[PDB]
Each structure stands twice: as C-alpha cells, then as structure tokens.
Ligand binder design. Sequence first.
Ligand SMILES: [Cl-]
Ligand SMILES: [Cl-]
Ligand SMILES: [Cl-]
Ligand SMILES: [Cl-]
Lengths: 277, 277
Amino acid sequence: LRVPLQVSSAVIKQEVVTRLAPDPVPLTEGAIGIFLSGTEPEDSGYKVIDNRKYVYSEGHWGPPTANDTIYLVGNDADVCAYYPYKDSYTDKTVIPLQSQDYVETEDIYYALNTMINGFTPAITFDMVHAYSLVELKISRENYFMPCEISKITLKNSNLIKKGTINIAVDGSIHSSETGNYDLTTVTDASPHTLSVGESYVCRVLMIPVPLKIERTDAEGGEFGLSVSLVIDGQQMLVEIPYSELGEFRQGEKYVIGLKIKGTEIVPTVKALEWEDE
Amino acid sequence: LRVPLQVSSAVIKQEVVTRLAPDPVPLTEGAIGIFLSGTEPEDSGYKVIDNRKYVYSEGHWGPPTANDTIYLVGNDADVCAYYPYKDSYTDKTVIPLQSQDYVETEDIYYALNTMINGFTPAITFDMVHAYSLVELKISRENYFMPCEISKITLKNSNLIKKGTINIAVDGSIHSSETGNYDLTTVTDASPHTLSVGESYVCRVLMIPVPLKIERTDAEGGEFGLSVSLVIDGQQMLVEIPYSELGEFRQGEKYVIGLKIKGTEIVPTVKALEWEDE
Ligand SMILES: [Cl-]
Ligand SMILES: [Cl-]
Ligand SMILES: [Cl-]
Ligand SMILES: [Cl-]
C-alpha cells in the first residue's frame, strides 16, 4: 500500500549575514529535480528514483503526468531535491558546479536528504544556494582616457573553477579544477567602455571556498583576493584585505566596489621670505 | 671743493611675508654698479656717472683704483645702485630683466635714488630683489612608471618673459614680451627621471606681475597660475587656486609642491544576503 509524496512547497533559505531571516520565499515557477532512495536498513523496499521532474502548477508542485508520481510506502526513504531542474543531472552525489558569469538558470539551490514515509508523506524543500555571488561595481573618478576595460580576473590560489556537490548527504564540494577566474562578459574581442558617472556591474556565480592569505606586507596587513583589470591596455591589480574578505560562503553576496582614480597632481602653495631661517 | 662718496654698506632688504625683518644682511663680496646724476635744479654741477664699478675689499665698498672715485660737491646728487655689477648695464632707467631658470648672478638687487651731497657723503644701499622666486618641489606617490619629466611650463596670460626696470626713480617694470614660461633645466633633449622618494627642486627667477583669473568653475572657485608637465610623454595640467597665489611680488619666494599620484583603484567590500530588501 502506497500514497503519493506531497511536495507542500519549495522555499528559498536566506542566509543570515546582516539581518535575521524572515519567512522563506516560496518558489512559484519552473521545475525541480527530485531524488529518492530507500533509507539504509538488506531490502529498503524502494526502487531508486533519480532526477524526477516535478512542476509548479495551480499553486502546487506535482508530477507533470500521473505516471511521474513518486510513491511512498510504510518504509523510510531519503528524499532530496534541487532547483531549477536540468534533464542531464542524473547523479545527486556529483551535481556539477562551475564558477561562471552570472546566469539565473545556473543559480542552483539544493535541499539535503529528508527521511520520509507514507505515514507523513508531506515534505517542504528548504533550498539553499550552492554558489556564492560576487558582485563587482566599477566606477570612474578624475579619469581622462576612454576607460575601455578588455579583461577582469579574480585571483586567489584557492579559487575553484570546476567541481561537484553532493546534494543528498552533506552538500560537500569536490574540487576538480582550481585557479584564477577570468570574466567572460568583457574580453579583448568584446570590451566595455566605462563612461563618466557610469556604475558597471559584473556578477559572478562563484564556487564557495576559504581564501588563502596571498601576501603579508611590512606593517603586518594580510591580503586574500586580488582583482586584475586591463584598462586602456594597462593591467591594474587591486588587493582586497583578508580581514574584509576571507571566504566565499554559500548563499552570500559580496559587493566589491572598484573606483578607478586617474593620475592626479596635488598642488601646495607657501609664500615666504627669499632667504630661509 | 669735493669729497669722495662714502659707501657705508650695501644691505639686502628682506620682505615681510611670514615674519618681521631683522637687521638687514650686508653684502660682503663682489661688485656693485653705481649711478650718479645731479638733482634737478639749469646746471646741476655734476657730470653724469653711469654704472661705476665699486668693489668690496678690506671690509668696505670702494673704487677699484683712485681714478674710479665718485666725488660729491655742495650741490645735491641722485645716487642709485644695483648688485651684482654687469659691465654692459649702462642705463639705470632700462636695466634688463628676463624670466629664467634660477642663476645666482642673475638675481639682481637695486637701491632707488638717494639725494646726497658733500656735507653728508655717507650712503647705505638698501638693495631690494628685482625678481620673484618660484620654487617647484616635485615628488611621486603610488606611481609605477619611470616618471621621466621632459617639459615644465608656468602658465598665465599676464606672465612677463622680458622687460626692463627703472632702478633710479620708482622700480617700475616695463614689459616687452608676455606669455607662458618654459623651464630650460628639463627638455626633451635634456629630461629628468624622478625617482621614488626624490624631491626634484626647480627654481625660477620670475618677473613680478599680478596674475589673471584664467578660470572660474561652477562652484565659483577661481584659478590663476597653471603648471603643465610632460611626464612619460603624457601632458598633465595642474591648476593653482587664485586665492592661494594671485601675484608674484618682488622679493618673495613661492614654494609650489607638486605630488604626482599615479592611477589607483580603491576597493570597498560589503557582505550581504543574496536577495536585497
Ligand atoms: Cl496507486
Ligand atoms: Cl633660494
Ligand atoms: Cl680731489
Ligand atoms: Cl542578484
């Protein structure tokens, strides 16, 4: 005897950074990918379900057709989910991640395993962001050249370029490629000219990682992330103090303001007697 | 009946800029040029003496030989002088002036006419500077290029390049050529590379002149002098506020500090919740 799984809602978990989290915002569009496996007993009483698509329709999440229904029996099952559904994401333990310029459909949320059975078939998926959001806000002040940006690179030896996340058990990320991140929104082929009074915003989905202290100066000051920019053919490096940014944490947004101040001659005037004393 | 002129001393008049003037410093070397003409009566009783050389020797100013002695009679004479003596400066009403890079022998002092006769033949020449001294102090901060200076120009429509001064009657300056002043100590042929921590000092003998307000910005702020510098092939203009420097006054020194601050990217970091509110 079996009853259908009841997906009550899929809500977005807001991280506590500057304020306490209000009631979570429910997802009211698109599709989720659901995984089910029988809880470890050796017959669990369940056939494995990998990446079953559930769609939001008429105020609730449900199977697109009756044959897509996920059923629960008296035995316990481990159920996890992610959003937005992707047809090829067939293994919950190795869900792909890639640091990239922000694309809304690439912003993945996941809900770790919940133990559930047919006696209490109702579930709420508490969706956490898999990535960090890095937001660059680039402006000009007293700059008298075109200010054409042809390259933007995020630098730290710990940055993860590619990896996978286990959305079922612990949300642990397996790194497959590390190194500096080059933004694709601005290139030598596709450059961006920053105008006077313009605020140029570049958003990047970044794989969460603690940053390495890359430099300690004579005064003891520590530096983690660097931002390299090619402005009017000239490479400019910006060092971010480690105390200000030491880690990219899951579900947090880091707004990095970068104000380009052009070469300046500061004058001082003092009128005096011809011969000093 | 005649007695020799007695040059008691030739002293430097210090201008009152920041402190009151102490006892004037006496000139104790070199030579002065003396002019004598009979005071306006029509026979004055004097033959005109133009640019007579007097030399400092054995603690006093005097003629190099007995035949060079300047004599005074009962009748009044008008006596003026300048330092340092120049063999060709034969007309006291048109003593040449030229704005130029500082050269100590080009730093002219003059004492206006004193009425004197054989009853009181002792004179003290109160020597005033004919020029203003402009002193540029050029430094670097956060500059990552060679910082090779190939040109320095002082800019204002009122600047006098060449002229003459009447050292006898009033010290009034007759302008013969106006315009911007180009320093000769640094050229494309002869450039200067400013090193890290270096303070490059450029001194200029400038013909005294009130400066013109060359620009008034939207905020009402007024600008007089400009300093144009060609650093690593790039022309850089520095505007001096008119309130800070409105005139080049005779015998005053103007120290103009110019700190070259290279292009800088200022970073700001704020960690936040992913979705703002
Ligand atoms: Cl059934
Ligand atoms: Cl000096
Ligand atoms: Cl005699
Ligand atoms: Cl966003």
